[PDB]
Design a binder for this molecule. Structure first.
Ligand code: EN2
Length: 116
């Protein structure tokens, strides 16, 4: 509270670490459904069903222009990608399984990097 400050993390490396984690996502072989925005003029239903579309290139753009205030909001956008994926696709479809794979890949790197 006012004039009662907490021991805080050292966040000076966060931007560089989030960029490295996103680079590993972008280069994973199962990243192909997520590299670019879902083509709303070519995918029937997506616009109406998915309230907040999100993809790796939009996340990369936001990270390179200072639009994430903290690493918590960055993880929100990453998880948003895979939440959208689960909502719209079958778990055992190709896109659906890629999303499960990529989510597990992300959460391991998140813990390995920031829960040390
Ligand atoms: C997450 N999600 C993705 C799609 C979807 O149709 N995505 C198109 C991928 C095109 N296929 C590629 O291989 C590719 C894409 C970009 C790139 F830079 C290189 C290759 C549909 C429903 C859904 O829920």
């Amino acid at each position: 509270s006012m004039s009662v400050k907490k021991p805080k993390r050292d966040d000076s490396k966060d931007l560089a670490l989030c960029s490295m984690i996103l680079t590993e996502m972008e280069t994973h072989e199962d990243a192909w459904p997520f590299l670019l925005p879902v083509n709303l003029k070519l995918v029937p239903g997506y616009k109406k069903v998915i309230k907040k579309p999100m993809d790796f290139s939009t996340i990369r753009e936001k990270l390179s222009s200072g639009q994430y205030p903290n690493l918590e909001t960055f993880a929100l956008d990453v998880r948003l990608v895979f939440d959208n994926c689960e909502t719209f696709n079958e778990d055992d479809s190709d896109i659906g399984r890629a999303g499960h794979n990529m989510r597990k890949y992300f959460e391991k790197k998140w813990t390995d990097t920031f829960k040390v």
